[PDB]
Amino acid sequence: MIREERLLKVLRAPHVSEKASTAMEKSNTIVLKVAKDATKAEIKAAVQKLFEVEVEVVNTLVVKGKVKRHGQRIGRRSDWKKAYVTLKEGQNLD
């Protein structure tokens, strides 16, 4: 049983995009931004407990940070994890 406070730290932010909205309205899958070290079980448990929704399966991928250029200095954005949480049929989420 994964701890509650750990669940309270797994989810970072909802990912907002055209593909995300399309997935939400067509495949009942929400795209969330999660912690880089989170496992599928932790993400599933965190969504099921904190949002009170039934999760079918979780798909994750690691997004590489882009190498940007602030003026003349070359810098790199932070890597982040992205999770496709597929809610069960009939469920609704904000």
């Binding site: 509650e4 406070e5 970072r12 932010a13 909802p14």
Partner: protein, 62 residues
């Protein structure tokens, strides 16, 4: 806040910590979208969790 919190039991500190963490999660989710217009609350709740954790380590195991 530290003085007020010091006259509390270990289980009271734990439930207070859990309430603070849930509050922090709601604030973080609210701040992700543009709904939150009070940015100082994130730092506030973070320092509160820091204080409670500090007091927990101070009381338990010492």
């Amino acid at each position: 806040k530290a003085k007020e919190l010091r006259e509390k039991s270990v289980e009271e500190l734990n439930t207070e910590l859990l309430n603070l963490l849930r509050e922090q999660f709601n604030l973080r989710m609210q701040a992700a979208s543009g709904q939150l217009q009070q940015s100082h609350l994130l730092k506030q709740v973070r320092r509160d969790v820091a204080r409670v954790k500090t007091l927990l380590n101070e009381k338990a195991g010492a």
